[PDB]
Amino acid sequence: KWTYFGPDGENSWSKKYPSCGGLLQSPIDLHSDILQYDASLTPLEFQGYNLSANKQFLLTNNGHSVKLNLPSDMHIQGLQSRYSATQLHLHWGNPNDPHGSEHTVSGQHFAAELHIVHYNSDLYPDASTASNKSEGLAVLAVLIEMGSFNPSYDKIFSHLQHVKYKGQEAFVPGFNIEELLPERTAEYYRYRGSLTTPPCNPTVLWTVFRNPVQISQEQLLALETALYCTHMDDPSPREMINNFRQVQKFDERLVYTSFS
Amino acid sequence: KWTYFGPDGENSWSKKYPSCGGLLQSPIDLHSDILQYDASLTPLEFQGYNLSANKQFLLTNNGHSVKLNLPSDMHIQGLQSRYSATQLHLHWGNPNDPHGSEHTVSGQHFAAELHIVHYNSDLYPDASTASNKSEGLAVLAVLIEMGSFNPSYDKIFSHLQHVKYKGQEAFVPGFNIEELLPERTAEYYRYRGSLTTPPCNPTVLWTVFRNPVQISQEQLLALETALYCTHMDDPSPREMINNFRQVQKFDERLVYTSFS
């Protein structure tokens, strides 16, 4: 149906998913010429992010990414509407070219990128209904670079063995999702954009934190090598690598920054 | 019909031009992880590039770029077949964002890009026939940065006001096309890719010179303000700006370098 490689790749998404060729597409290059300081961009509060260690949360390989389901009582405070969590997932490159972030900064890819997807729960009953509606979604984006081992990211990565193939599922004990966020979360880029995957609805309020997090070389290699896009019994297995969209044109538009 | 902006822009080309969603697409980002030095990449020789100043060559606005028709006596010596010139054209950005090269280097756009299109004249009777055939085309790409006034590029730019609208044609006296090339032409990037416009046939042997040339801010502003994608009488005129494709996924390709 859709892929990041070959005939069903990103240049063909618009055939079945017309919004992928429409307005307000993400991701984009965040570069000095288009940044504008906005003193109105106050710090977000992360509420209910400390997930009950007594709850288990579904981890899925959906053939596009690895996705952790999140509970709706987890939310962002600070925007006009409350935005409630639905899921998080990641984007990455491959061991030969370990630069698979979606957003770039001054033309540079980061190793990987985490998305924590939220929906406008003040206006909409669920993320599906919100996804194609005004003010529907808000995503927190964390840029990931290689560095020190990260025990918080290992709370997800330690389970990748159990979701190797498309359709496979595992359970993750609740942990503090705020541990996945970088230093100085008050420092971020903000713009109106889209889902970076089909159906590419232009309904996302993007918050890209200024500061990256670090995971070890072994953690990054595990993420790049652990998963397949294909079902376990597929006779032509496809490694899940390079699951990021190319940057989109962004002309006559600003990205607002919470930092000078 | 196709454009670089809005509904008929590059994310939609594959709807009408299936190769635009196929493999081996251009342009690409030239970055260290995908470069490989290849000592077999010997210097190209540019034969019959010194066009007589007493002859004249047809400049055309084709609604996508400004193109100069070249004589088939003009050719590249050094490849495994003779490649004869057919045309040169450019890609550029806009007055407020003069960063419209197609290829990028470590994620940075240059101001503009020159393409000198050649076809395999050993095998094919013309460029159109060569264009959908194995080994059919060879393009020389020159990266253009904002710098000093360039008298050689001005031999083209001085005629822009005669080809303002789609379908307009003007004659340019011959000059030495080698003057459009940079210093140290022996140093280049080489890879297999495609037309960067529809129909995006994956039939181009790319040579991108390592070193950029300079043209002035005033030359870029002329190029960025002179031309229209539309006919002179079109009631919905469209400025010919930002006529570059976004960089493409590598699809496991390497880029070979003639320089270590």
Ligand SMILES: COC(=O)CCCNC(=O)c1cc(S(N)(=O)=O)c(Cl)cc1SC1CCCCC1
């Ligand atoms: C058939 O496959 C799909 O439509 C979506 C699959 C993968 N996409 C997501 O998981 C996804 C990604 C983003 S991103 N990369 O922009 O942060 C976002 Cl914002 C949302 C979703 S899932 C969303 C899709 C529409 C219905 C609600 C759930």
Ligand SMILES: COC(=O)CCCNC(=O)c1cc(S(N)(=O)=O)c(Cl)cc1SC1CCCCC1
């Ligand atoms: C839908 O087709 C067109 O009208 C093409 C118009 C613009 N494209 C080109 O002129 C063109 C561009 C490149 S690039 N930007 O990759 O260097 C190349 Cl390699 C070839 C062509 S035109 C093609 C036409 C067939 C004979 C000559 C080559």
Ligand SMILES: [Zn+2]
């Ligand atoms: Zn995402």
Ligand SMILES: [Zn+2]
């Ligand atoms: Zn071109």
